[PDB]
Coordinates of C-alpha atoms and ligand atoms in Angstrom, one line a residue:
X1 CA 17.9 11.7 26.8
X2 CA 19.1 15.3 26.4
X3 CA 15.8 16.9 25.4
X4 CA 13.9 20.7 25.7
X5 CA 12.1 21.0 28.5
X6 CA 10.9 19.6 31.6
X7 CA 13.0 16.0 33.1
X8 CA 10.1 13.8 32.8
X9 CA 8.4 14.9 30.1
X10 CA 7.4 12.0 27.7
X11 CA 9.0 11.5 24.6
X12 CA 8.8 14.2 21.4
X13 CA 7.6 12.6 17.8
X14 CA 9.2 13.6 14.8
X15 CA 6.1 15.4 13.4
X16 CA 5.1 14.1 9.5
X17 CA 6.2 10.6 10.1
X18 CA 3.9 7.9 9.1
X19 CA 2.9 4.9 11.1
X20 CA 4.0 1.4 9.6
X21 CA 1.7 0.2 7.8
X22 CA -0.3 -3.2 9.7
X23 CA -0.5 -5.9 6.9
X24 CA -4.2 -6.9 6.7
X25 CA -4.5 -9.8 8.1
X26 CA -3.5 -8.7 11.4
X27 CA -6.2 -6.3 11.1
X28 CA -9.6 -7.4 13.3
X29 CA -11.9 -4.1 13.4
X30 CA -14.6 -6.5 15.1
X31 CA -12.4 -7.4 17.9
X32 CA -12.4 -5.2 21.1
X33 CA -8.6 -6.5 21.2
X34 CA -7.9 -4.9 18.2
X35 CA -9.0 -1.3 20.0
X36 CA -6.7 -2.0 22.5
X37 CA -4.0 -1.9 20.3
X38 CA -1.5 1.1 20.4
X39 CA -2.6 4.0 18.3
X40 CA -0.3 3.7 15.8
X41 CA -1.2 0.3 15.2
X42 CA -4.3 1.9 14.7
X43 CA -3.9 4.5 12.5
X44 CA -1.6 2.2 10.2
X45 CA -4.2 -0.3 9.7
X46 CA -6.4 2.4 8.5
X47 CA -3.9 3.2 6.0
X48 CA -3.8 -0.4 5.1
X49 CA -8.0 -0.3 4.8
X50 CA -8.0 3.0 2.3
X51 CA -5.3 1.1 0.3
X52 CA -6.2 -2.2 -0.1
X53 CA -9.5 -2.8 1.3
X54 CA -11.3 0.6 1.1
X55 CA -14.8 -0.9 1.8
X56 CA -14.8 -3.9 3.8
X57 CA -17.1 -6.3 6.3
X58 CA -16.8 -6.9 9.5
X59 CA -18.9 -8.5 12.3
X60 CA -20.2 -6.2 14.8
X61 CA -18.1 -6.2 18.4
X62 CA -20.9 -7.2 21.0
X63 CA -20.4 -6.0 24.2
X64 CA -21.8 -7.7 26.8
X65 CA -25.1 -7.7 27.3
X66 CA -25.8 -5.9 23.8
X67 CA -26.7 -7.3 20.7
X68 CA -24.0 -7.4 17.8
X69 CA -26.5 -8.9 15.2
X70 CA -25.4 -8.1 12.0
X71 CA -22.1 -7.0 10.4
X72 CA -21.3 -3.3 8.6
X73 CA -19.7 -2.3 5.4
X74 CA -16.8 0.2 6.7
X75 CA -16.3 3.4 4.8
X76 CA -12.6 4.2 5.5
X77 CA -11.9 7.0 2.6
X78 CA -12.9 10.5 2.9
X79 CA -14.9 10.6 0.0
X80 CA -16.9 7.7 0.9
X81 CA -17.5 9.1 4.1
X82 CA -19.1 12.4 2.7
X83 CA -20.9 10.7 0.3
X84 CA -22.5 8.7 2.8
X85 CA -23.7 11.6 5.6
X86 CA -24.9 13.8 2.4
X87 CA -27.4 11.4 1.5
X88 CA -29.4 10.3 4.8
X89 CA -32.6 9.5 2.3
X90 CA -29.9 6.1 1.2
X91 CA -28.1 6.2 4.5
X92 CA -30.4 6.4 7.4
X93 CA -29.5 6.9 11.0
X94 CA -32.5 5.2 12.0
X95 CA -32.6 3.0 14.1
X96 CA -28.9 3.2 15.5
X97 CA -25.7 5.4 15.0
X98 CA -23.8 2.6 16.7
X99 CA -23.0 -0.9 15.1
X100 CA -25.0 -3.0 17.7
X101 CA -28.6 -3.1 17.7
X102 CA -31.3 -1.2 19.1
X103 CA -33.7 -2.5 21.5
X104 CA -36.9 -1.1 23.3
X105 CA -35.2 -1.1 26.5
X106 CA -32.3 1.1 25.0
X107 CA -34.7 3.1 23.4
X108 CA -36.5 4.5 26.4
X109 CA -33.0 6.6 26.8
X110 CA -31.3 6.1 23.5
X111 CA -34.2 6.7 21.0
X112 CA -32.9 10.9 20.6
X113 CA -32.7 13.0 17.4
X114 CA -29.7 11.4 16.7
X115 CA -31.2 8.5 15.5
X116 CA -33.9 9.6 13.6
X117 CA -34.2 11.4 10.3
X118 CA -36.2 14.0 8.7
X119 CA -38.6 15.9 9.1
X120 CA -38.9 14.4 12.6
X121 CA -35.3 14.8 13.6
X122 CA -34.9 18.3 12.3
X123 CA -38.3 19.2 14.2
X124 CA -36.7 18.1 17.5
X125 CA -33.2 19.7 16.5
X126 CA -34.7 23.0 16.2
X127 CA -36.0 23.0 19.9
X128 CA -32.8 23.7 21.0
X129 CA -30.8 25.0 17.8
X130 CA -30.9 29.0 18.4
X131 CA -29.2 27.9 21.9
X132 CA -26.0 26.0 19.5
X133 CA -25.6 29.1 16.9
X134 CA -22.0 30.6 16.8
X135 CA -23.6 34.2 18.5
X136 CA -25.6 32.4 21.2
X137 CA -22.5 30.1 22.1
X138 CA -20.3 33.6 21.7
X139 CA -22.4 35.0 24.2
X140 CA -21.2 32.2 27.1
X141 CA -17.6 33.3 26.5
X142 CA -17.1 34.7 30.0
X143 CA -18.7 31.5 32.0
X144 CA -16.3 29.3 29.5
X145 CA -13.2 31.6 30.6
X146 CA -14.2 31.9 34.7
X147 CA -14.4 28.0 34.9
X148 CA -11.5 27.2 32.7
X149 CA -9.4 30.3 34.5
X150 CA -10.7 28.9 38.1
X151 CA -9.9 25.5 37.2
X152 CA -6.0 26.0 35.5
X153 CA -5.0 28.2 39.0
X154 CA -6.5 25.1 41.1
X155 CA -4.3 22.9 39.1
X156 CA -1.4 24.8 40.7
X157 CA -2.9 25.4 44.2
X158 CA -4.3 21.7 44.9
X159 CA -0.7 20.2 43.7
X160 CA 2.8 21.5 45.7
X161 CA 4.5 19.0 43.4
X162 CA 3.3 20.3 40.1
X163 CA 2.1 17.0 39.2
X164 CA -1.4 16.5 38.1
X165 CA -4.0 14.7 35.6
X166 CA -5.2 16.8 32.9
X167 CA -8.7 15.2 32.4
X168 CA -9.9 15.2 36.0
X169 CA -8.3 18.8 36.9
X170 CA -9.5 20.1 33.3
X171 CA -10.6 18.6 30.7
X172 CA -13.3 16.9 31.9
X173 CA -14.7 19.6 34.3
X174 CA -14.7 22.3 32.0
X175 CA -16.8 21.0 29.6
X176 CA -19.3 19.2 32.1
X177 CA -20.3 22.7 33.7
X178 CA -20.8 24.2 30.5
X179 CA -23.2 21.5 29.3
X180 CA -24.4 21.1 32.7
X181 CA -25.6 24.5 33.4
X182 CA -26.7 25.6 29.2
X183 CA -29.2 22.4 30.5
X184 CA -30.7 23.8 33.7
X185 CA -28.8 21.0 36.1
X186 CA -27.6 22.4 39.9
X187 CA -24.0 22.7 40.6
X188 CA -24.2 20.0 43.5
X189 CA -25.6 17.1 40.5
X190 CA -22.4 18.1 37.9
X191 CA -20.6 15.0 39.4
X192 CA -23.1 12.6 39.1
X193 CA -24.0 13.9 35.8
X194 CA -20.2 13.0 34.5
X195 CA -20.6 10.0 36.1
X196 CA -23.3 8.9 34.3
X197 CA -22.6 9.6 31.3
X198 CA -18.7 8.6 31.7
X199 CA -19.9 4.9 32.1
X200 CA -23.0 5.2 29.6
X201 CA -20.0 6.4 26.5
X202 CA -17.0 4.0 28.2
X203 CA -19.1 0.6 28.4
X204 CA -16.8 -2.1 27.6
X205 CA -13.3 -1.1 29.5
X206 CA -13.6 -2.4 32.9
X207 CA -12.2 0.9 34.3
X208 CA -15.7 2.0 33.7
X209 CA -18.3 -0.6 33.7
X210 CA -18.6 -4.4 31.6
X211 CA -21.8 -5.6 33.4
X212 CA -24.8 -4.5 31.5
X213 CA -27.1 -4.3 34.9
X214 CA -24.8 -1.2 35.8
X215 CA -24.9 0.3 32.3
X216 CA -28.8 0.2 32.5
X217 CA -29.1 1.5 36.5
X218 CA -27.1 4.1 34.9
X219 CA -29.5 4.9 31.9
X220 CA -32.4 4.5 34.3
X221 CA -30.7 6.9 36.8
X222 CA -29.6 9.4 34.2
X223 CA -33.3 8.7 32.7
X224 CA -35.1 9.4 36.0
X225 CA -33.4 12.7 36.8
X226 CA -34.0 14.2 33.8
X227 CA -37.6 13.2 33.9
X228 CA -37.9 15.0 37.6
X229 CA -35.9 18.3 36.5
X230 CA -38.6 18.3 33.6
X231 CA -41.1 18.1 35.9
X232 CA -39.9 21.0 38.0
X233 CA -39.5 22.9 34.8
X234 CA -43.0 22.1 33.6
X235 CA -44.3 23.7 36.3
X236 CA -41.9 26.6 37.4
X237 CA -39.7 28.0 34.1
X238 CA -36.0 28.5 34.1
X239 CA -34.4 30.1 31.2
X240 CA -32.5 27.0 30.4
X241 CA -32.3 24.1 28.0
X242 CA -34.0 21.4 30.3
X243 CA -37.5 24.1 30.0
X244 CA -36.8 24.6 26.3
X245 CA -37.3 21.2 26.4
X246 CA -41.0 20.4 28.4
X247 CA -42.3 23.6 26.5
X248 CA -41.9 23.0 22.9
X249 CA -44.2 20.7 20.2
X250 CA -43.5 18.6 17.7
X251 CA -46.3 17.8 15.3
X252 CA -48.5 19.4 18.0
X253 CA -47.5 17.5 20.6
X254 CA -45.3 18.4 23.6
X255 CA -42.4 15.3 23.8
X256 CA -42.7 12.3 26.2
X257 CA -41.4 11.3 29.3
X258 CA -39.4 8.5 27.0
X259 CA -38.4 11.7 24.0
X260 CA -37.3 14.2 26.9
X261 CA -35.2 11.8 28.7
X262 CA -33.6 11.1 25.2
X263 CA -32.9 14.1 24.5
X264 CA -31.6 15.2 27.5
X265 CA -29.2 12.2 27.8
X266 CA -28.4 13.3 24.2
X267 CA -26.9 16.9 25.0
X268 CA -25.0 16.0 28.5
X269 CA -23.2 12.6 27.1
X270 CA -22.3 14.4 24.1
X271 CA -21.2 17.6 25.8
X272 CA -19.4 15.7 28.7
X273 CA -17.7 12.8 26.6
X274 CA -15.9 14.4 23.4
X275 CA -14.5 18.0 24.1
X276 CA -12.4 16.6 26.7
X277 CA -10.7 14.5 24.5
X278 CA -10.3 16.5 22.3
X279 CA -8.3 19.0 24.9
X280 CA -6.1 15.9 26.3
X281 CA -4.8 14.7 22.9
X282 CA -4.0 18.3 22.2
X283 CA -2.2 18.7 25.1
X284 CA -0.5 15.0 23.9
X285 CA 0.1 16.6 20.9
X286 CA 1.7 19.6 21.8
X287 CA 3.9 17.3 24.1
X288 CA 5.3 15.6 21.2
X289 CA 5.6 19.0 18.9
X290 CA 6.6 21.4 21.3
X291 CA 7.6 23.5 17.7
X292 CA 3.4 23.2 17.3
X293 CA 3.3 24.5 20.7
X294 CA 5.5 27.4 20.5
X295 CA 4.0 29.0 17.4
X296 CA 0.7 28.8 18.8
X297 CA 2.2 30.2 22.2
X298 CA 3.6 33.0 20.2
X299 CA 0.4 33.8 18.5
X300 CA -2.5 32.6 20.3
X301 CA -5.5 34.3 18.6
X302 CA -3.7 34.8 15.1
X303 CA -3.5 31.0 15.0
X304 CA -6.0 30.1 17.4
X305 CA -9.1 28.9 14.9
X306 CA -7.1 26.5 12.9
X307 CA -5.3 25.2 15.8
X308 CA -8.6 24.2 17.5
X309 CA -9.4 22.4 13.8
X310 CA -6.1 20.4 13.9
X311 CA -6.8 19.4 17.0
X312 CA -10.0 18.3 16.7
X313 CA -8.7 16.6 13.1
X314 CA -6.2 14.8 15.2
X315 CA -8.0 13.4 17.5
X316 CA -11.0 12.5 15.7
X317 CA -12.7 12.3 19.0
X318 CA -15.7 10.1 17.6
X319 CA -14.4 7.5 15.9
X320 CA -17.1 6.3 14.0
X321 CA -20.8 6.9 13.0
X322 CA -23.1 4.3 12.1
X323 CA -25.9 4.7 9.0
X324 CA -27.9 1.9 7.6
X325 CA -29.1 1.4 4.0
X326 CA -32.4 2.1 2.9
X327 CA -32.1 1.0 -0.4
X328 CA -29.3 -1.2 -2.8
X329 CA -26.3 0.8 -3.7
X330 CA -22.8 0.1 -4.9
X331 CA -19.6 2.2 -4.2
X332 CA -16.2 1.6 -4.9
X333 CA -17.7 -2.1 -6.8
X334 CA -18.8 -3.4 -3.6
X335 CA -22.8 -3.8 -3.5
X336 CA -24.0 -3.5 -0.1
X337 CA -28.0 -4.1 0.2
X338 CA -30.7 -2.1 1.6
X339 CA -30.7 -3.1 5.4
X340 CA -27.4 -3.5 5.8
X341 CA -25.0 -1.5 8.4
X342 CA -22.7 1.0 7.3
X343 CA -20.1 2.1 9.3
X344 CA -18.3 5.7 9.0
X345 CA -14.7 6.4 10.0
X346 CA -14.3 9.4 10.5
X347 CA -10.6 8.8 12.2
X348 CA -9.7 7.3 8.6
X349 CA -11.6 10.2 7.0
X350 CA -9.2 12.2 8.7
X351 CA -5.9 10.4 7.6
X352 CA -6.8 10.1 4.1
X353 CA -4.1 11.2 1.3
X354 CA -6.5 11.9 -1.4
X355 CA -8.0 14.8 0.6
X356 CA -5.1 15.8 3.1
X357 CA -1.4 15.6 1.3
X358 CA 0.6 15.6 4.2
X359 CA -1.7 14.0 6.5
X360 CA 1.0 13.0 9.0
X361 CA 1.9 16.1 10.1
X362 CA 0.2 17.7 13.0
X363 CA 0.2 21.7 11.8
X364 CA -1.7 24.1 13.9
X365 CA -1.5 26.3 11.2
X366 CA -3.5 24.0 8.9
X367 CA -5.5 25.5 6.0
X368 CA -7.6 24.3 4.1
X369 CA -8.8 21.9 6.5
X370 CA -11.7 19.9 5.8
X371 CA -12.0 17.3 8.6
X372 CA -14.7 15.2 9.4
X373 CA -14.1 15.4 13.0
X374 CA -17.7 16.7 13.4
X375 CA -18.6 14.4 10.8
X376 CA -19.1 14.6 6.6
X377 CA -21.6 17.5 6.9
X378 CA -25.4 17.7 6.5
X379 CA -28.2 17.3 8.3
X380 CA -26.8 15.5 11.5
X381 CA -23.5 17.7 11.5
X382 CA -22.5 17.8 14.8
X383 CA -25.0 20.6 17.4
X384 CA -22.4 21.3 19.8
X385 CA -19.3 21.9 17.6
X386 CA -19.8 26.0 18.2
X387 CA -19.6 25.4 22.1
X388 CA -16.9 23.0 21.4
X389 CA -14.2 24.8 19.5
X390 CA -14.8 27.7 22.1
X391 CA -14.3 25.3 24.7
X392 CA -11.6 23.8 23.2
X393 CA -10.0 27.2 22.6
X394 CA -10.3 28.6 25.8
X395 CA -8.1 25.9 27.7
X396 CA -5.2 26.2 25.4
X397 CA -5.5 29.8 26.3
X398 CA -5.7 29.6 29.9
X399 CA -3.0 26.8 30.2
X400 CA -1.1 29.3 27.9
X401 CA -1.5 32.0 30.1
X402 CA -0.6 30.3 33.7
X403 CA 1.4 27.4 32.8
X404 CA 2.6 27.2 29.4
X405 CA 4.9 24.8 29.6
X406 CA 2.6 21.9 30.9
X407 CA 3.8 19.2 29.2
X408 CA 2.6 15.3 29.8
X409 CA 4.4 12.8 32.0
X410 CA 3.2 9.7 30.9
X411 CA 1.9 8.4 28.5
X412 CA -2.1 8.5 28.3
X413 CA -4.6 5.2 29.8
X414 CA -6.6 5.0 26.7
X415 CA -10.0 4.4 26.9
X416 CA -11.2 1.2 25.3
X417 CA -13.9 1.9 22.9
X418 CA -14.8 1.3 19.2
X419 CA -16.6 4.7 19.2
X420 CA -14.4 7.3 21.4
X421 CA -11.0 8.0 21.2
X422 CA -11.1 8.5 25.0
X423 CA -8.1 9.7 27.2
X424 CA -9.0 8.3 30.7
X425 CA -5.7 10.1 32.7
X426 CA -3.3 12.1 31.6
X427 CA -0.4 12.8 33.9
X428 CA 0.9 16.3 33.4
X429 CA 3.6 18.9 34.9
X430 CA 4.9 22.5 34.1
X431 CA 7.8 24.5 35.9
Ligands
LIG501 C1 -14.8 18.0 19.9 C2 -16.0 17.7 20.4 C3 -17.1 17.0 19.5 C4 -16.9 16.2 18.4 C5 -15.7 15.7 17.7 C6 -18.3 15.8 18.0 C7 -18.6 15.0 16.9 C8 -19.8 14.8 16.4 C9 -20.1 13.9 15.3 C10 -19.0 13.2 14.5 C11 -21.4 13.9 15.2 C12 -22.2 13.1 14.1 C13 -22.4 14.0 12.9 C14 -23.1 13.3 11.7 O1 -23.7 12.2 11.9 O2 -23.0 13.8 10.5 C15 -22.0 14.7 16.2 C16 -23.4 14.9 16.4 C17 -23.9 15.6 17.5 N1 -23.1 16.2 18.5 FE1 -21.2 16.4 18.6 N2 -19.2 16.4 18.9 C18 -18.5 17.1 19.8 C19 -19.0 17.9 20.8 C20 -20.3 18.1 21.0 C21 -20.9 18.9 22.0 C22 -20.1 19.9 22.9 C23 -22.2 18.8 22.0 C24 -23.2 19.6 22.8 C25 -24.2 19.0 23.5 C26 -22.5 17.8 20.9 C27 -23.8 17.4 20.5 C28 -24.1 16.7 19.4 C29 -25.4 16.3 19.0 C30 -26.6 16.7 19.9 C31 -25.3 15.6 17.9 C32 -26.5 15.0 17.1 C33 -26.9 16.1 16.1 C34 -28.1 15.6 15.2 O3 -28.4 14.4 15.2 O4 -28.6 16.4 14.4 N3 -21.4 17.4 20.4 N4 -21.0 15.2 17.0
LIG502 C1 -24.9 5.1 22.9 C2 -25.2 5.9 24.2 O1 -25.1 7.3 24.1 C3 -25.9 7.9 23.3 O2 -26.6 7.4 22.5 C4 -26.1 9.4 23.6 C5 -24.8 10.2 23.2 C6 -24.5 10.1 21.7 C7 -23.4 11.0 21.3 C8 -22.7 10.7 20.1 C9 -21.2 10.9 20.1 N1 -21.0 12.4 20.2 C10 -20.4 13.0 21.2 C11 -20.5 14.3 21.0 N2 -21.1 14.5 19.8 C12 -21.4 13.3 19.3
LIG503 CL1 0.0 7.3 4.2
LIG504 CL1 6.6 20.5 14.3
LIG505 MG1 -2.9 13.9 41.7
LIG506 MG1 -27.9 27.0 36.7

């Protein structure tokens, strides 16, 4: 009640403390009830998982209007999990990386790179991979810094009561104009963009959207403008990602209405829907270890790249990844069968003992640190995770800079998903 800092700040976490362990039969992974548990509910029945149960079955969560269909083997220990993304010939990402099933209907906007594997997938991936490199993505630095700048001093002007949420005032824009202009898309469409694709990745928690009718007007929508800003592209050039797109071949072949819209889909959900959460659990984080705040405060760029790593290892801001089994295989004694789901955790990956010995302990100075926040490695290992440690590192530094004690309020409205760790609001002040 006496506390550092600001009156209303929320409650500091004595860092390196491990969550309860949640005794297994309380433990429903195929439950969206079980999501909406508190987060360190969460993390403790992971730790129950990688000790007792480290591969396990579970039916598949159907949301409505998609299909569950069959149940997944989940991979909670690190090794498992690298195991599994370093050999896509057994583990295929075809035909889904989530648990439920594909359809055709999905697949007219969900039928991307992503879900595909080689050759094909690394044919489309290099369309757009020179654009992704750590020089290309250094080269955006001073767009990344403008916005971020622009939108931390807005924070302060649009509020007299220093009171504001951190994912609509900057989390969530920042990483939407990036995206949204790397792809070719006007200023005056950003919103609708992050609309979009805030429904398409938060289907299931009625904040966003639980009737299936809106989730597909929303694919079709999402579908249809990137077919039209193609079209424009095809026929007048822009040096951006949307023309990279309508000029290249694959095989020979430029890429269909149906493989365009894919892709594009692809690059804005995923650029609009994970860096942001990633920057409000950090700021969560720092809020609870204001000791982890002070030392990178004290030495921003000294500390800076394994800061942005313990972030993203904290919030493991894709929980899982989905692979199914293209042939028999056993691991750990437990036979799973070619055809059968096979579900990554990355979050669990990222708790695990045998890999991390103090995995408890949020420590900005971190190192080694071999996360699997942008997933086990290999051929599908995460495009954007260049543009989003720079992302991620430039808002620290610019709410450093002009407010650097912002500190959370409240505690955060979790999203409700199986597959984000999403932050929906997160009420902030600073002095
Ligand atoms: C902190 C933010 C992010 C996290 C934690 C994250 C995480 C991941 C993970 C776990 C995967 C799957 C890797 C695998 O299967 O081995 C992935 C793939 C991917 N990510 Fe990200 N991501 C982030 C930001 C971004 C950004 C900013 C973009 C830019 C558009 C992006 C684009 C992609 C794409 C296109 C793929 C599929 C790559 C492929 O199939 O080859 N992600 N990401
Ligand atoms: C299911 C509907 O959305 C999609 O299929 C398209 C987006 C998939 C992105 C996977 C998660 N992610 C976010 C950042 N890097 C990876
Ligand atoms: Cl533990
Ligand atoms: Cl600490
Ligand atoms: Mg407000
Ligand atoms: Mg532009």
């Amino acid at each position: 009640h006496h506390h550092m800092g600001l009156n209303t700040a929320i409650a500091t976490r004595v860092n390196g403390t491990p969550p309860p362990e949640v005794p297994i039969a309380d433990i429903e992974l195929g439950s969206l009830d079980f999501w909406a548990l508190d987060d360190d509910v969460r993390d403790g029945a992971f730790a129950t998982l990688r000790r007792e149960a480290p591969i396990s079955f579970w039916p598949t969560i159907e949301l409505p209007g998609f299909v569950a269909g069959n149940g997944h083997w989940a991979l909670t220990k690190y090794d498992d999990v690298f195991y599994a993304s370093r050999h896509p010939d057994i583990f295929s990402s075809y035909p889904n990386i989530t648990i439920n099933d594909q359809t055709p209907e999905l697949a007219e906007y969900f039928g991307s790179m992503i879900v595909l594997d080689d050759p094909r997938h690394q044919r489309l991936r290099s369309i757009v991979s020179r654009a992704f490199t750590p020089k290309v993505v250094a080269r955006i630095e001073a767009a990344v810094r403008d916005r971020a700048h622009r939108l931390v001093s807005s924070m302060i002007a649009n509020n007299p009561d220093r009171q504001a949420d951190l994912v609509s005032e900057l989390a969530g824009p920042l990483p939407l104009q990036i995206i949204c202009d790397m792809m070719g898309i006007p200023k005056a469409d950003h919103q609708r963009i992050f609309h979009w694709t805030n429904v398409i990745l938060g289907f299931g928690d009625p904040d966003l959207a639980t009737d299936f009718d809106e989730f597909m007007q929303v694919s079709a929508d999402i579908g249809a403008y990137a077919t039209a800003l193609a079209e424009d592209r095809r026929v007048n050039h822009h040096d951006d990602l949307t023309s990279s797109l309508v000029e290249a071949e694959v095989d020979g072949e430029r890429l269909s209405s149906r493989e365009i819209a894919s892709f594009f889909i692809l690059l804005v959900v995923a650029g609009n829907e994970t860096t942001r959460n990633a920057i409000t659990h950090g700021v969560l984080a720092l809020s609870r270890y204001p000791e982890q705040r002070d030392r990178w405060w004290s030495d921003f760029d000294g500390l800076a790249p394994t800061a942005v790593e313990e972030i993203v290892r904290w919030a493991s801001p894709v929980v899982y990844m989905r692979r199914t089994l293209t042939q028999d295989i056993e691991l750990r004694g437990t036979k799973m069968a070619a055809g059968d789901k096979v579900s990554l955790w990355y979050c669990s990956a990222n708790r695990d003992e045998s890999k991390f010995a103090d995995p408890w302990t949020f420590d900005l100075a971190r190192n080694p640190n071999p996360h699997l926040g942008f997933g086990g490695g290999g051929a599908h290992f995460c495009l954007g995770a260049n543009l989003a440690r720079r992302e991620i590192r430039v808002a620290f530094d610019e709410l450093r800079r002009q407010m650097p004690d912002v500190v959370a309020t409240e505690e955060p409205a979790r999203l409700l998903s199986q597959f984000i760790h999403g932050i929906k609001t997160l009420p902030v002040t600073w002095s």
